[PDB]
Amino acid sequence: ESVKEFLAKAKEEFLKKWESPSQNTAQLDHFDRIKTLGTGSFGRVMLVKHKETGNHYAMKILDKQKVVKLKQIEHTLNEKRILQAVNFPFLVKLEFSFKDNSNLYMVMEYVPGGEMFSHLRRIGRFSEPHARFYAAQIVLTFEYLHSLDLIYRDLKPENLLIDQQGYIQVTDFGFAKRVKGRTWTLCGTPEYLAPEIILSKGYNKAVDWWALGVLIYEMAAGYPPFFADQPIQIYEKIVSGKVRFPSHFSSDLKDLLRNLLQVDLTKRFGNLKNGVNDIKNHKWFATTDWIAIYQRKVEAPFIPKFKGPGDTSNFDDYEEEEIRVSINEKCGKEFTEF
Numbered sequence: 001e002s003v004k005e006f007l008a009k010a011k012e013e014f015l016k017k018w019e020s021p022s023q024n025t026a027q028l029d030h031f032d033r034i035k036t037l038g039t040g041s042f043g044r045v046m047l048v049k050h051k052e053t054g055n056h057y058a059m060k061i062l063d064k065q066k067v068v069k070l071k072q073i074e075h076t077l078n079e080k081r082i083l084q085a086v087n088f089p090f091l092v093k094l095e096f097s098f099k100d101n102s103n104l105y106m107v108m109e110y111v112p113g114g115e116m117f118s119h120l121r122r123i124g125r126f127s128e129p130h131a132r133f134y135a136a137q138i139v140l141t142f143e144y145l146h147s148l149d150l151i152y153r154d155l156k157p158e159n160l161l162i163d164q165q166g167y168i169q170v171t172d173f174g175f176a177k178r179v180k181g182r183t184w185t186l187c188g189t190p191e192y193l194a195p196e197i198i199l200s201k202g203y204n205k206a207v208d209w210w211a212l213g214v215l216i217y218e219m220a221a222g223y224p225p226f227f228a229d230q231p232i233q234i235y236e237k238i239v240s241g242k243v244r245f246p247s248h249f250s251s252d253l254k255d256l257l258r259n260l261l262q263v264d265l266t267k268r269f270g271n272l273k274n275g276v277n278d279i280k281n282h283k284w285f286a287t288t289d290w291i292a293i294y295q296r297k298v299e300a301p302f303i304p305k306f307k308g309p310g311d312t313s314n315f316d317d318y319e320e321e322e323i324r325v326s327i328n329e330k331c332g333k334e335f336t337e338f
């Protein structure tokens with residue numbers, strides 16, 4: 001009942017913000033630009049510093065004209081509307097949003113420890129206790145999101161930031177969506193796509209649980225279970241029903257992964273009548289204190305090395321390009337609700 005009442009209150013608070021989203025809560029010249037942290041086909045993420053408070057933030061900047069061209073309008077409205085409405089210990093916090101003639105802006109707490117991707121590649125692979133610590137946070141985050149009728153759809157090591165206490169902060173809600181029933185958009189990263197996405201079926205929250213299986217495999221092995229030079233070759237392996245496990249995997253880990261990487265979505269863990277409890281009660285999680293994880297009372301496997309809230313040493317170097325704002329408004333109608 002404690003879990004039921006927790007999720008009931010979580011949905012109440014989410015729906016209130018979902019129905020009346022915040023808008024236009026800062027502007028660009030409130031911030032100093034420090035460094036580019038990441039870049040993509042229609043946007044980038046910048047470390048900025050608020051000029052009055054001195055607080056650091058990660059500012060995601062989306063070029064409206066490129067969003068329209070790459071057909072991401074609904075997705076970018078999804079991302080901001082969901083992000084301003086959620087509240088959970090392992091979700092990055094959105095502090096401000098706003099738009100101008102050229103760009104959409106989402107200003108989030110800056111997580112200085114870097115992406116899980118970098119740490120995993122630097123160490124090679126995580127021990128099973130280490131992987132289990134991160135996986136538990138994802139299980140709880142998906143329990144939270146799915147109860148709000150949200151699907152995340154972009155689980156991968158690059159989107160999991162390690163914070164100052166060594167806990168996960170999920171970033172990038174670019175593909176997240178509120179869904180009652182099924183949805184159909186082809187999106188995600190090829191290595192992490194469930195078979196039903198590849199086969200163009202109407203799919204549901206089960207694709208997140210599949211992605212968790214890929215993520216746990218990758219954390220524990222150092223590479224994802226379906227790998228190839230071309231995406232088409234990755235897709236053939238995903239739909240085949242065949243995964244090979246390293247010998248060092250425990251029997252409990254292999255058993256959990258066979259049930260998360262179940263190609264038949266009606267037999268996949270997290271999508272059965274017991275929902276998430278088939279995962280939480282699995283023998284691989286027998287040592288996990290779910291409440292202690294939620295309360296951030298478990299000592300983390302490692303704390304990232306960084307010097308302070310403005311340290312960027314755990315992120316990589318990108319060409320520094322202008323943040324240009326046109327003298328004319330672009331795509332005003334398409335982003336009216338942002």
Ligand SMILES: Nc1ncnc2cccnc12
Pocket residue numbers: 037038045058092108109110111112161171172
């Ligand atoms: N919130 C963030 N904090 C730190 N680095 C990031 C990189 C990409 C996206 N978001 C962030």
